[model samples]
Target chain A: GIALGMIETRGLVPAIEAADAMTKAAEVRLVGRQFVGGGYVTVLVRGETGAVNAAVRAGADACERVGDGLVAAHIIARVHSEVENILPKAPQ
Target chain B: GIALGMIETRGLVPAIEAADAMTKAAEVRLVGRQFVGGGYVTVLVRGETGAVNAAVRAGADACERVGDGLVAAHIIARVHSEVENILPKAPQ
Candidate 1:
């Protein structure tokens, strides 16, 4: 099954770097982004479950340079439709 | 007419304190909250225009006790329907 991966960071630049590296490391698609004030940004991705797991780890590796800017990273092996309804996340 | 007041803070505890103080200091109705991970929280209120304005000010005043939790605040005398579209804000 396709899954979603997210990398959240406090720096706009680091978030972008994570997205870029994630896409390059696996067959993942950089799908969308969500941001809240105070510099919190979330990069979203979708791909095969294994690909997504790999991408999240890859993204986290890239985010290390962000220092305190890197807050968290996670992958949803499977997400509920209603939960994904929070945003129009691309179909996987 | 009822207006919407929003007070954004950096800590959950301070945000709750702001909501508490705002409701006490003004005839405003504590309505909802919006939280962005990493400690950012937003308290929402609805009330008569003047009351909403006063409540936001009162909330900001209370948030100051958080060291640096107070972020920003404002009252929408007449929030646009579309802006309100993002949230099911109570009728005002």
Candidate 2:
């Protein structure tokens, strides 16, 4: 099953770094991003379970290295179908 | 000229707190908000110079008290007309 991974960061720049690192670390598709408010933003990705896990770790590391940017990171090994409905859409 | 003040925070909740604190601290209007990504969000307000200054400080302080949420805070004593064109618009 494809996994869903996400990282939350303290600023937009950090989130951009996270996304770049995540994509470079593993074969993952940058799926979505959302700004929830208060300067908090989140990036999402999807890929094989192992790939998603690796990507998430790399994303978090890169984001945090950007001077206290990382806020949270997680991966759902198999996301529920309904969850996709509420996800922020990303242009391919 | 109305002063423009802004505060950046690490999350949505903290930004909300900043906005509330800013408004309560002085005679200011919640002007706008923007999410730049990486989990960074900013809130904007407009009012008299002194009011904007006090509002920015209050917003920053309140945001920070919510556990490392504040990123940056500033005020433009007199915003330029061109700057307003690029600003995020707020609903009345």
Candidate 3:
């Protein structure tokens, strides 16, 4: 199942601005982003689960106020499950 | 100078085959590829300067016959002139 929240806006700058405010208020940090089709922008955030949730809501509210109420949010908690091993030291 | 040409095809297998035939006819070899958006497939080839040019033409022809005539190609060629020192062997 999906775990992240996403928001869509008609304009790019406003959506980014709203995301910035929400993440700051929740004490979360913005990580990365990738642009997709149809004027869609995906923003990545990292922090506590509760803080992430709060940030998502705040982001949606900001988008509604700043843009045209076209916000979608998806939460992603655990991104990967692979564990890599550390290599042993070489003999002298 | 540009020394290679490229072709886009609807199906992955056909594009690969056409590229194969072109490279074979020109005595070249397929090298690598990277997928792009909008159902676009990129094929890479390598060979001698003249052979690369010939291979590009052959690839376009092959694509046209097997599928739509929406063939496209580009070439890249250059000669290196840098010199570097060779390390000496260690004593036994």
Candidate 4:
């Protein structure tokens, strides 16, 4: 099952940076993000379970490494299959 | 002044119901939505302060009326001016 990783950030810029870092840290694919307004943004990563986990770790670390950025990152080891269809899919 | 109302839910179905109820309950426009994986969906509404406030209230209740739905709803009385540009503006 393709795992999903998420990172909530205080701003759009930081969320973009977190997404960039996540992509670079593992083989995970960047599935874009959601703007929650009020300066809150959430980026996502999807891929093999282990890769998604590694990327989420590196992503949170990347945020901290970049000015101890505001963030809340988590990984869903086994996301519900229906949930995947609800989310924005990564561009082919 | 433009105001924003947001409703976060555990499922897309409830989010849609909340959005519909928000619009039907107030003069706010159904701007759009954001899907945060793992079954969470956030719906946004824009309008005058009082309208948005009323809409958010109705939205949360609409969710509950639909099955004790999961929701976290809020209204930003005077959202940052810059946020208007960042968010999906209500269609003209």
lDDT of 3 by residue, A51-76 (tens): 77888778777766665443345454
> Which is the better candidate, 3 or 4, if ranked by TM-score?
4
Q: What is the TM-score, restricted to chain A, for candidate 3?
A: 0.66
Q: What TM-score, to 2 decimals, does candidate 3 have?
A: 0.39
Each prediction's RMSD over C-alphas, in Å, is: 10.4, 10.7, 16.1, 11.6
- What's the candidate order when arranged by decreasing lDDT? 2, 1, 4, 3
Candidate 4's error at A32, in angstroms?
11
Model 4 agreement with the true structure over A1-92: per-residue lDDT tens digits:
47888998754434545666677777877665776655467777788998888888877876654322556999997878788777777531
True contacts kept of each: 0.02, 0.25, 0.00, 0.00
Put down candidate 2 lDDT per residue, B38-85, tens digits, no spaces: 557778888999999998998888778653478999989987788989
> Which candidate number would show the highest DockQ if scored against the true structure?
2
Error of 2 at B16 (Å): 0.5
Score every model by TM-score.
0.51, 0.51, 0.39, 0.51
Which stretches of model 3 miss by more than 4 angstroms? A1-5, A82-92, B1-92
In model 4, the clashing pairs are none
Clashes of 3: 22
Deviation (Å) of A27 in candidate 4: 36
Best by lDDT: 2
Candidates' DockQ values?
0.05, 0.11, 0.02, 0.02
